[PDB]
Amino acid sequence: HLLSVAPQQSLVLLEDVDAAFLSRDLAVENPIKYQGLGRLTFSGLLNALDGVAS
Amino acid sequence: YIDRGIPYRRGYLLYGPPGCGKSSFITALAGELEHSICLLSLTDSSLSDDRLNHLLSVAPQQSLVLLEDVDAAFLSRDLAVENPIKYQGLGRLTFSGLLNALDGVAS
Amino acid sequence: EEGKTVMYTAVGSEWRTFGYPRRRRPLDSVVLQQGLADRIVKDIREFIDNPKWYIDRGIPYRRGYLLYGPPGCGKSSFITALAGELEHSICLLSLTDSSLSDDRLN
Amino acid sequence: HLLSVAPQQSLVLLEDVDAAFLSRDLAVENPIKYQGLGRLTFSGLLNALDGVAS
Amino acid sequence: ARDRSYAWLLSWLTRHSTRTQHLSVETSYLQHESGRISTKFEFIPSPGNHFIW
Amino acid sequence: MPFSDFVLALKDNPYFGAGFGLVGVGTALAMARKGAQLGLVAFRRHYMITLEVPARDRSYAWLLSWLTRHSTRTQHLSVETSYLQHESGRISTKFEFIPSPGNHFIWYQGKWIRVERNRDMQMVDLQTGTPWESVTFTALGTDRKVFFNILEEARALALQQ
Amino acid sequence: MPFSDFVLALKDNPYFGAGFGLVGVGTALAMARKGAQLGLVAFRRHYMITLEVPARDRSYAWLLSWLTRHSTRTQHLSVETSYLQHESGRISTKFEFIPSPGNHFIWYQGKWIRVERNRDMQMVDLQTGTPWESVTFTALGTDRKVFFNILEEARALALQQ
Ligand SMILES: Nc1ncnc2c1ncn2[C@@H]1O[C@H](COP(=O)(O)OP(=O)(O)OP(=O)(O)O)[C@@H](O)[C@H]1O
Ligand SMILES: Nc1ncnc2c1ncn2[C@@H]1O[C@H](COP(=O)(O)OP(=O)(O)OP(=O)(O)O)[C@@H](O)[C@H]1O
Ligand SMILES: [Mg+2]
Ligand SMILES: [Mg+2]
C-alpha cells in the first residue's frame, strides 16, 4: 500500500537494505530470515519492489 | 468434470530462476483471459487455516488466486526430510491447513 | 439440503455450517482397492444399525476409522463419497488451531 | 523526530553508546545486533545521526 | 451467579414455573434409552417478572 | 368509606371538576401518543419498503459504488482522493465525491427512494476497518423488485468500467 | 355504550371543551415540529451544498493547510509551534496559527462558505493519530464547482511555497 500511494514526482529511499534480512551464510542457507522488528518478509519486499500489483 | 465426480479445480506451478517471466506471464494471462488476480500472502500474520479456507471459498468469480513464492512459507529440504514441516512464518498457518485448503474436503 | 453434503466447522465452541451444501461425490467415482470400499461401508453401516448390541454389553457407542497411505491415493475423496452415501454431514476439525483447548475439544 | 525537535542551543548527549548494540566479534559478524529493549536499529541510529532527513 | 445455589435455583425455576408464557429456548442433546441422541427443546423462563403460587 | 366519603369529598371541591377535566386530558394525551406509534407501524408495515445493507457484504461495496455513480446532482458529498493512472503513462490525483452521511433522495424508476448513509456508532465490525457503516433504501410502495433491480444494476456497474 | 355514553359524558363537563381545545393544541404542536424537520430537509437538499472531508485522506492535509493560509482575519485560531530554518543557517521558533475548532465564515468567490473544524469524538481512526478530525464546507447555492475550485486551489498551494 505504501509503495502504491507514494506522492507523485518522488523518490522512495530504502537506505541500508542489507540490515533488513540475514545474508551471506544465511543467503546460502534455505531461508532468508527477517532480522527485523515488524512482520515483513523477503518475499513481501520482492513482490512489492517488482511483482504483479506493483 | 461433473459427469465424472472430479472436483472442478485446477492449479498451476511456474518455477525457474528469478527474472525469467513468471509474474509477467501471470499478468499477461490474466489480461488475456479477462480474469482478475487475487493476491494471497501465505506468510502473513492474520492468516489462519480457517481464514485461509474461507478466503479460498469466497474468491471472486472469474479470478486467479496467486500464491507467489510458496517455498518461503514453510521450511524445506532438510526440514522436509525431518519429521515436521515447520511454518517459518508470522501467522497461525500450518502445512496441513494449506494442503487441505488447496485440495481437501471443503475446498 | 438433500442431494448435497453439508460441511460444518468449529466457530468458537459450536458447529456452524461452512459455506453452501457441497454437491455429493458419487461413491463409484472413487476407485479403491478391490473390496475396500464395500468393507468400510458395511462396517460403518453395521455400527450405525446396531446400537442395542452396544448398550446390552456396556460398550461405548462410538467408532473411529483411520485411512493411511501415500498422498493422492484417495483418502479425502473416499471420505466425501462415504459421507454422500451415508447421507451424513462432515464436521471438519483442525487440531493444530490456536483457539482449541482440551475443554473446548471435549 | 526527537533529533529533529531538539531545543535550539542545546547539546544532544548519547552516553555509553557501546551498550546500545553488540560489538567486536558481532561487528565482525554480519549483523550489528541491537542488544537493547526498544525497537531501535543500527541503521536507524546511523541515518538519524547523519542521513537524508537529519 | 457466583454460587452453585444459582445453578440449583435456575434449574428449579425451569422445572416449577406453572404455565409461564415468557420463556426462552435452550437446545440440548438428549440421549435416548434406545442408544441414539435427539435434540431436546427445553424452555427456561426468559428475563422478566414471573409469578408463582 | 373510601367510596362514599371521597365522592362527597371530591364533589365538594369545584377544583375537582377541573381536575377530572384534566384527567381526561391526560388519558387522551396518552391515547394520542399510542395512536401515533400504531399508525406509524402500520404504515411502515403495509406501504413502505426498506432494504438495509451491512458493511459485512460485498453487496455493500457494489451498492456504495453505485451510489457514488448514480447520485443525480446530490450536494451533500464527501471527498475521496485517489491516484488515477492516465493513458499517457503518468499518474495524477483524482478527486472523487461520495455522498456524505445523511438522507439523499433519488428518482429511480419513477419512485422517490430515500437512501441514507448510516454512520459509525461504536467502531466494531469484522472483515473491514470496523466502522459499521450501512445504507438503508426506503421507498413508498409495495413492490420489492425496485431494490432487486438496484442491486443488479449495481453489480453490472461494478463489472463495468 | 363507549360511543354514546362517553359523548354525553364528555359533553357534561365544560372542562372537556377546553380539553379538546388543548387536544387541537397538541395536534398542532406535533404538526409544527414535523413541519420544521421537512422544511429543513428540503432546504438542505435543494439550496445548500456540503463537502465533508475525513482525516483518512491527503485532501484533508491539503485542505487544512489551505484553511490555515486563507482564513481572512479569523479570530478563533489555535497555536502550532514549529522550528523554521532561516536562510542565515540557524533555526528559530515559528508561531503558526490554525483556526481552532468552531464555525468560521469566508467570502470565497462572492459566496459565504461556512467551514466547520470538526473536533474529536471518540479517538478512533487509522493512518493518523486517531483523532477523527474533519471539516465540513457548507454554503448556500446549487453549484458544486466552488468546492472543486477550493480543493484544486488547496492542492496548488500545497505544491507552492
Ligand atoms: N519473457 C519476457 N518477456 C519480456 N519481459 C520479460 C520476460 N521475462 C521477464 N521479463 C521482464 O523481467 C522483469 C521482471 O519479470 P518477472 O517479474 O515476470 O520475473 P519472474 O520470473 O516472476 O521473477 P521474480 O520471481 O524475481 O519476480 C520485467 O521487467 C519483465 O518485463
Ligand atoms: N481412488 C481414486 N479414485 C478416483 N479419483 C481419485 C482416487 N484417488 C485420488 N483421486 C483423485 O485425486 C485427487 C485428490 O485425491 P484425494 O484428495 O482423495 O487424495 P488423498 O490421498 O486423500 O490426499 P490428501 O490427504 O492430501 O487429501 C482428486 O481429483 C481425486 O478425484
Ligand atoms: Mg516474479
Ligand atoms: Mg486429504
Residue numbers in the entry:
A (entry chain B), D (entry chain C): 268 to 321
B (entry chain A): 215 to 321
C (entry chain G): 162 to 267
E (entry chain F): 55 to 107
F (entry chain A), G (entry chain B): 1 to 161
Quote what the paper states about this structure.
The human AAA-ATPase Bcs1L translocates the fully assembled Rieske iron-sulfur protein (ISP) precursor across the mitochondrial inner membrane, enabling respiratory Complex III assembly. Bcs1L is a membrane-bound oligomer, with each subunit consisting of an N-terminal TM segment, a middle Bcs1-specific domain, and a C-terminal AAA domain that is highly distinct, forming a clade of its own in the broad AAA protein family. Here, we captured Bcs1L conformations by cryo-EM during active ATP hydrolysis in the presence or absence of ISP substrate.
Two independent ATP states were identified in this work: ATP state-1 and ATP state-2. Another smaller EM dataset was collected with similar conditions but using a different grid type, leading to a uniform ATP-bound reconstruction at 3.46 Å (C1) and 3.02 Å (C7) resolution, respectively. Surprisingly, this map has the membrane cavity better ordered with the TM helices resolved (ATP state-2). To obtain the best resolution for the TM region of mBcs1L structures, we performed 3D reconstructions in C7 symmetry for the two ATP-bound maps (ATP state-1 and ATP state-2) and the ADP-bound map. For example, in our ADP and ATP state-2 maps, we could trace the density all the way to the N-terminus of mBcs1L, depicting the structures of the entire N-termini exposed to the IMS to form the IMS seal, the complete TM helices, and additionally the apparent ordered densities that could be modeled as lipid molecules circling the base of the membrane basket. By contrast, the ATP state-2 reveals a near-complete structure of the TM region, showing a similar membrane-embedded basket encircled by TM helices as in the ADP state (right). For the ATP state-2, the TM helices pass through the MIM at an apparent tilting angle ϕ of 60°, leaning down more towards the membrane plane compared to the ADP state that has a tilting angle of 70°. This difference in ϕ results in a shallower TM basket and a slightly more opened IMS-seal with a diameter of ~13 Å, which is consistent with a previous observation by AFM showing the IMS seal undergoing an up-and-down movement during turnover. The EM density for TM region of mBcs1L structure in the ATP state-2 is the least well-defined with reduced local resolution, indicating elevated mobility in this region. In the ATP state-2, the β-sheet I tilts away from the MIM, unpacking the seal loops and opening the Matrix-seal.
